[PDB]
C-alpha cells in the first residue's frame, strides 16, 4: 500500500465523475501545469482564475495547448452581478453590494463564491496566498457543515516501507479546541479517514491514559471522548490515551486494557494545535512518514489550502483529494 | 556515539568519586541486583533501605555476597531523632515532631531526608512507587535549586544508527508552564544536556515560527524565549520555532533565517506537557529513538524516579546518571 497505490485509488474514485475545481492562482505556473495535467488525464475540470489572455499565455509558455480551459476573470465577470448580490445575500449586516463589488474581486473570494453558487464542486488554493486568504472566505460564504461548528486540518500520514497509514488531529486550524469541538474534530476525521481507505480506530491523545494524570486539559479530552461516542456510536473511539497506549500493544495491555482502540489506533486526535502541529512534524521528520499536506474537513463544499512552497505534483494530489471530497457531497 | 559509549563516558565521570545513592526500594530484586552491580564495579555506594536482615536475604537469594552493604531500616533508625527534628525544622507550620515520626517512616521520605542531611549525595527510586511518592518528598525536603522555581523531566533521545542525540523539554512534570517557568526549564535543560556531552542549541517549540501563527500560547513561548535569553545570554536559544524549522536546514532557511538555532537544534523545549509527553513518545515509537527515562532537573540534590516496570539495567543507568548529577553539585 504505497502512495502511488493510494492515489491510484483516489484517481479511480474521481475519474469520469467530471468534478469541477477552481484554481484561483492562474498566475503560478505550478498550478497551471497541474491544472493542465488533471484536465487531460480526465480527473477533473479546472476553472482557472485570471486575465483570460494572461493565463492562456502561461499555458503556452509552458508548452500546453492554448484552448478549452475554462478561464474566468474576477474583474471582468460576465455575471459579476448575480454574484455580487448572492454575496450580501449571506452576510446581512456586513452584507453590502458596494462592498461585494470590491471584495468579490479578490481571486479567492471569487473562487469560494463560484463554489457557493454551485458553479464549481470545489477549490484548491494557497500556492501564493496565506492560509487565511483561503480559509476566511471559505468560512464566510460556504460554511461549516450542518453537524460541525469548526473546520479542522487532517494529515494523511503514510510510511509505505512499513505498511503504515494514519491520520492526524487538526494540526492546522484550532489553537485550543473545546471538548465539544474536539469531539466534532474526531467525528469529522473518521469520515475523512475513510476517503483514504482507512478503517478508523480513533484515539483521543493526552499525557494521561484513562485517569493516570489529572488536570483540566485531561478532563477536556475525556469529556470530548464521551461527547464523541455520543455523536456517533459506531466509531471505534477511545478516550484519554497517551500516544504509546494508542500505538503499541504491549503498553495498552497494561495502561488501557479492555480498549477497543488502545494498542492499535490509526487515527490520532490531538488535544490542541501545539501538540498536533509539533507532533505530526516529529512523525514526519524523525519518523520518516510522508505527510500529505493539510486537508481541511467539515465544509459544505471542499476547499483546500496548499502550502508555502508546494510542487506541481503536490497541487495535483491535493486537487485529487479535493475532488474525491466533493464526491461525498 | 552509541548508548554504550555515552555510558562509558558517564561511568568515567563517576568512577572513584564515591558518590552515595539511596535506594529506597530494598524490596525489589531489580534494585538489589542493580545496587549490587554498581557497588562492585566501583561506581557508587548504594544505601539500601529496608529490614537489614530482609534485604540481606534477597541479596543471597539472588546469589550475591551478603556483607558490606550499607543497609538502613526506616522504622528502626539509630538516629530517627536528629532526623525526625531536621524534618519539622523545614516544614515549620506543618513541621511537627509527632507527624515527622510517622512520615519519615516511609522509605522515600526517609531517603530524601538522608540526602537532605548530607548523609547521601543522591537518590533513585520509583520501581515500586508512584512518581508522586518520590517527587513529593523531594520537593518538600530538598527543594528546587536557587535559580529555579519548578522541576522538570528531560529525556535523553538517542538514535545511534543515525548519529543523533537530543534532549526533550519537560515531558513529565509541568502540566502547562508559565513563560517564566518555561524559560527556567530551558535554561535548566541546557545544563543537563551538557552532562550528556551535548552542546546545546535550544529551540522553544510552538505551532508558530517567528510570528507565523498568533495566539496567547504563541506569546507564552516567545516571551519565555526572551526571558530565557535574559537568564543566560551564552545559550544558543531561539524562540517560537515549529519542529521542522528547528530540525531541518531547508525549512529554517525559509521560515527562520538568521537563526542561531533553527535547522540544527539538538535541545527541544516543549510548550506544555501535552505536546512534550505525546511528542517524545512519537519520536521514540515512530522515530525509533531510545528514550532514556525521565531525568528530573532543578533540585539541590539529584533525585530520580524510575518507571513503572523498569529493568535492572534501567536502574543501573539511572543511578549512574543520578550520580553524574550529584557531581555537578
From TrEMBL, chains A, B:
Annotated keywords? Acyltransferase, Transferase
Keyword Acyltransferase on entry: yes
Pfam families linked to this entry: PTA_PTB (PF01515)
InterPro entries found in the cross-reference section: P_Ac_Bu_trans (IPR012147), P_AcTrfase (IPR004614), P_AcTrfase_dom1 (IPR042113), P_AcTrfase_dom2 (IPR042112), Phos_Acetyltrans/Butyryltrans (IPR050500), PTA_PTB (IPR002505)
SUPFAM superfamilies in the record: Isocitrate/Isopropylmalate dehydrogenase-like
Q: Does the keyword Magnesium apply?
A: no
Q: Which reaction does it catalyse?
A: acetyl-CoA + phosphate = acetyl phosphate + CoA
Which GO terms of the molecular function aspect are on file? phosphate acetyltransferase activity
Q: Where is the Phosphate acetyl/butaryl transferase domain?
A: 11-323
The EC designation for this entry is: 2.3.1.8
Identify the pathway.
Metabolic intermediate biosynthesis; acetyl-CoA biosynthesis; acetyl-CoA from acetate: step 2/2
Sequence similarity = Belongs to the phosphate acetyltransferase and butyryltransferase family.
Q: What is this protein called?
A: Phosphate acetyltransferase
Organism listed in the record:
Streptococcus pyogenes serotype M1
Output the lineage of the source organism. Answer: Bacteria, Bacillati, Bacillota, Bacilli, Lactobacillales
Which gene name belongs to this protein? pta
